[PDB]
Amino acid sequence: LFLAQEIIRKKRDGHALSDEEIRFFINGIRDNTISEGQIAALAMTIFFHDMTMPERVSLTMAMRDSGTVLDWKSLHLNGPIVDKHSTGGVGDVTSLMLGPMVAACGGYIPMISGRGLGHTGGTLDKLESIPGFDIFPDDNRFREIIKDVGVAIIGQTSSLAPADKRFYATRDITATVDSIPLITASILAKKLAEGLDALVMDVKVGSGAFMPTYELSEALAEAIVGVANGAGVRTTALLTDMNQVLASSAGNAVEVREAVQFLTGEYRNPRLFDVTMALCVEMLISGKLAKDDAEARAKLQAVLDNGKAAEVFGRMVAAQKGPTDFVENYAKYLPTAMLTKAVYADTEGFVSEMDTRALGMAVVAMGGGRRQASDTIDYSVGFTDMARLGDQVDGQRPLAVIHAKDENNWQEAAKAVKAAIKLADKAPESTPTVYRRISE
Amino acid sequence: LFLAQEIIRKKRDGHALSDEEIRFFINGIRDNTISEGQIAALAMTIFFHDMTMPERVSLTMAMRDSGTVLDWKSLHLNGPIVDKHSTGGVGDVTSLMLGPMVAACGGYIPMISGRGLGHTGGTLDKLESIPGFDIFPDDNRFREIIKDVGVAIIGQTSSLAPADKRFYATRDITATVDSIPLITASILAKKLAEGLDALVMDVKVGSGAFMPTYELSEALAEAIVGVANGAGVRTTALLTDMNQVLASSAGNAVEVREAVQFLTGEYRNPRLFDVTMALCVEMLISGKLAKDDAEARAKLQAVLDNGKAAEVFGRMVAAQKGPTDFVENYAKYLPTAMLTKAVYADTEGFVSEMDTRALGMAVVAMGGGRRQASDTIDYSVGFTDMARLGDQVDGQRPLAVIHAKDENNWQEAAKAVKAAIKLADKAPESTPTVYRRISE
Numbered sequence: 001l002f003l004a005q006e007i008i009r010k011k012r013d014g015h016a017l018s019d020e021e022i023r024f025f026i027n028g029i030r031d032n033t034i035s036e037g038q039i040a041a042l043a044m045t046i047f048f049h050d051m052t053m054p055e056r057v058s059l060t061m062a063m064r065d066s067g068t069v070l071d072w073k074s075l076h077l078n079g080p081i082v083d084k085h086s087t088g089g090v091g092d093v094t095s096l097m098l099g100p101m102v103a104a105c106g107g108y109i110p111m112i113s114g115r116g117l118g119h120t121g122g123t124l125d126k127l128e129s130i131p132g133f134d135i136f137p138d139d140n141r142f143r144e145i146i147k148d149v150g151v152a153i154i155g156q157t158s159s160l161a162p163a164d165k166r167f168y169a170t171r172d173i174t175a176t177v178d179s180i181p182l183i184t185a186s187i188l189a190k191k192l193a194e195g196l197d198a199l200v201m202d203v204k205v206g207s208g209a210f211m212p213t214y215e216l217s218e219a220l221a222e223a224i225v226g227v228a229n230g231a232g233v234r235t236t237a238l239l240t241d242m243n244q245v246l247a248s249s250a251g252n253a254v255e256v257r258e259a260v261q262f263l264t265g266e267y268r269n270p271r272l273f274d275v276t277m278a279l280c281v282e283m284l285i286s287g288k289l290a291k292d293d294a295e296a297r298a299k300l301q302a303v304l305d306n307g308k309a310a311e312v313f314g315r316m317v318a319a320q321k322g323p324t325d326f327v328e329n330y331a332k333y334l335p336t337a338m339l340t341k342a343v344y345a346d347t348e349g350f351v352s353e354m355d356t357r358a359l360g361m362a363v364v365a366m367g368g369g370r371r372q373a374s375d376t377i378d379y380s381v382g383f384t385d386m387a388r389l390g391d392q393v394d395g396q397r398p399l400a401v402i403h404a405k406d407e408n409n410w411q412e413a414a415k416a417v418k419a420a421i422k423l424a425d426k427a428p429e430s431t432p433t434v435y436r437r438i439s440e
Numbered sequence: 441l442f443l444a445q446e447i448i449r450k451k452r453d454g455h456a457l458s459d460e461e462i463r464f465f466i467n468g469i470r471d472n473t474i475s476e477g478q479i480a481a482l483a484m485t486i487f488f489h490d491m492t493m494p495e496r497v498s499l500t501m502a503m504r505d506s507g508t509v510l511d512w513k514s515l516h517l518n519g520p521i522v523d524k525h526s527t528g529g530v531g532d533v534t535s536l537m538l539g540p541m542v543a544a545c546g547g548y549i550p551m552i553s554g555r556g557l558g559h560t561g562g563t564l565d566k567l568e569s570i571p572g573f574d575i576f577p578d579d580n581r582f583r584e585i586i587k588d589v590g591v592a593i594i595g596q597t598s599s600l601a602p603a604d605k606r607f608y609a610t611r612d613i614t615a616t617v618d619s620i621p622l623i624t625a626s627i628l629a630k631k632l633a634e635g636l637d638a639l640v641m642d643v644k645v646g647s648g649a650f651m652p653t654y655e656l657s658e659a660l661a662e663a664i665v666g667v668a669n670g671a672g673v674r675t676t677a678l679l680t681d682m683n684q685v686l687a688s689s690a691g692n693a694v695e696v697r698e699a700v701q702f703l704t705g706e707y708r709n710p711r712l713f714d715v716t717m718a719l720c721v722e723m724l725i726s727g728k729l730a731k732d733d734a735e736a737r738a739k740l741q742a743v744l745d746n747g748k749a750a751e752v753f754g755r756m757v758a759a760q761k762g763p764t765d766f767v768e769n770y771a772k773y774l775p776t777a778m779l780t781k782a783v784y785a786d787t788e789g790f791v792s793e794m795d796t797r798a799l800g801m802a803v804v805a806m807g808g809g810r811r812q813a814s815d816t817i818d819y820s821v822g823f824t825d826m827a828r829l830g831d832q833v834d835g836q837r838p839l840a841v842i843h844a845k846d847e848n849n850w851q852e853a854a855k856a857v858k859a860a861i862k863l864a865d866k867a868p869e870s871t872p873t874v875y876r877r878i879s880e
Contacts, residue, residue, distance in 0.1 A: 005613050
């Protein structure tokens with residue numbers, strides 16, 4: 001349909017839009033044939049009226065199609081194309097172990113990530129700590145890496161869902177941001193644009209989730225599973241705990257060091273392991289690489305214990321121009337911070353609360369993050385040996401270990417870490433790491 | 441308040457905006473500090489949530505204030521400053537007789553009109569038929585004319601409610617046009633900007649009204665009376681019949697000829713007279729120049745019968761550079777069309793329906809209107825001796841008399857006039873000329 005101002009009228013009156021109408025409107029945003037006012041108007045209408053399932057699907061596919069949509073039919077891969085998605089999280093290094101693990105199990109992960117623009121962190125920034133890691137390989141090479149190794153973590157090709165670039169911009173200045181149908185469409189957009197067979201969204205829950213209330217997180221996860229499956233991608237979602245840093249480290253290089261240690265069995269944070277393992281079985285069942293949670297967990301664990309998990313990670317790194325011996329000699333390659341010093345709480349007790357947001361920001365303000373989204377970042381700075389909720393902190397139990405560039409840099413950090421971790425007399429109730437698996 | 445994106449959020453959540461917030465937002469539109477998207481977003485929210493009375497008042501005053509607001513305190517006029525407003529209407533020449541009539545009765549009408557940009561017609565275009573009429577006198581002169589004569593009909597000073605210029609533009613392309621609080625605010629905007637003591641809106645009703653349903657017209661009129669009085673201007677409104685041309689003529693010069701004949705008693709269309717007389721008593725009671733509809737109608741009629749009405753009109757014209765003897769010698773001054781020829785209906789019967797819109801457009805397409813809103817208009821073309829609903833049309837009763845510039849120009853016109861006036865076997869029910877007086 002034509003006339004973007006009549007498309008608005010239609011929805012505004014509580015009516016629903018047809019595929020053709022949404023496709024036309026989304027493309028108009030891309031080609032600049034639809035004005036900012038017309039975008040914000042349609043957006044405000046969708047906020048009030050919401051969108052039905054077939055409209056929700058159409059919005060996501062209209063956007064995914066506005067740009068590029070990768071195809072692996074020519075690669076003649078005898079295995080499912082699977083990948084994972086999330087809504088961000090401080091210390092959520094899971095993607096680094098997930099890739100190898102599922103690749104070692106028959107999958108293929110064309111993990112096209114984006115550069116971390118703020119707070120939450122960035123998985124590509126993490127990988128750029130590895131001396132000579134290349135996140136921008138050409139398509140031919142990228143496909144070469146998927147076929148040969150099974151996984152690759154690269155940066156976006158800027159041609160992925162461009163209609164979403166200007167759509168979010170307007171929503172960002174018109175108060176039409178917080179709207180489930182818009183959010184789900186935007187989130188799946190670029191991710192479905194990889195040509196996935198099966199997806200698995202990781203909707204964080206808690207004092208650091210994308211959504212404010214658990215009810216909202218749950219609401220988003222069900223809506224994502226709906227549109228995703230409606231897009232043809234066998235998708236499932238999981239509500240995961242995000243009331244404290246997932247891994248034992250928050251930063252760039254320090255997280256990459258935890259990712260290799262988890263793979264080589266050197267060390268595995270109990271919590272990080274549950275969520276990482278949970279996300280993989282989904283990918284294994286959706287990808288049809290296992291049929292029972294028991295068979296899936298028997299598959300992933302083997303790889304984790306027999307080395308193949310670490311190996312695929314190695315081959316991935318070497319294939320993306322990193323060191324051929326990174327897994328074994330990572331200590332020699334990863335940047336070590338100038339001043340590594342621990343921080344203890346002013347008083348003793350138990351960790352009751354944790355502001356992951358404040359923590360994520362501190363790392364940003366410490367160097368491990370792009371402030372202006374253009375300024376360079378220190379890959380050595382971050383947190384390690386973080387204290388988990390429920391842990392006691394005395395004169396011998398630090399809240400965390402700060403890797404700063406200098407005393408003043410460590411000063412800000414320490415105060416921040418102190419101000420984000422609340423202590424108590426008694427340790428709080430233990431919360432589940434994986435709440436529920438939204439599916440079917 | 442600051443942040444136009446948070447002002448949006450406030451209203452969007454069903455909350456109400458304070459004066460300061462609306463004033464800030466309206467000014468931001470004027471100064472270009474608020475984007476088109478932010479305008480359309482707030483607009484879409486107001487469409488859903490509507491506005492309370494104090495918000496409705498604030499929107500109108502925020503806009504009236506964005507530009508110029510005339511003041512007559514310095515003029516030391518011992519009389520009320522009153523004026524009339526309307527929502528358009530084909531053949532609504534009423535403003536030309538209303539001015540003198542109320543001026544002759546102690547009032548002062550600073551009638552700042554706008555150039556007719558389409559269909560509905562334009563009162564300024566009408567007056568530009570008079571050889572040498574000056575609709576753009578400087579403020580000093582304008583005030584000189586009000587003080588000396590009592591009325592003046594001029595064009596806008598472009599400094600009247602500029603925030604409304606860009607507000608309507610966006611609404612016009614985002615489907616946020618049809619919203620009572622927005623419309624009332626926009627309509628009173630420039631009109632209150634004259635510094636009125638008492639106003640009287642003429643909300644047309646019927647097959648040519650601004651609103652579609654009588655219910656809607658009535659809805660608008662009550663909302664206008666609410667915000668107007670809330671602005672401090674003693675306002676009333678009237679629902680007037682608009683299911684056929686109000687006057688016996690539709691055009692520029694041909695309407696000016698009817699306006700002088702109504703004033704000199706030469707000829708007065710029964711219907712045009714009721715509405716014209718009705719509008720004046722309102723102005724007389726609101727202006728406190730009479731206290732009973734009986735005293736008002738006894739006042740206006742005297743002036744109409746004793747000549748003073750025609751005289752003030754004359755003095756107005758002469759004062760705005762028109763002919764000193766226009767009232768008496770108008771026939772010598774007003775442009776006479778090339779081809780004056782009548783049109784009869786293909787069949788005989790009774791006028792049952794009339795598409796004033798189609799009629800208004802025909803005049804536009806005949807020359808009496810600005811198509812591109814920049815192109816010149818023929819002041820001689822139009823309709824005269826129009827047939828009223830209920831009249832019989834035989835071989836001796838034409839539907840109207842067309843004043844065209846040539847046969848082909850008369851051809852289009854005749855077919856149009858034919859296609860807009862439906863005939864029947866029996867004459868339809870007689871409808872009221874003035875439905876109801878909305879007030880207090």
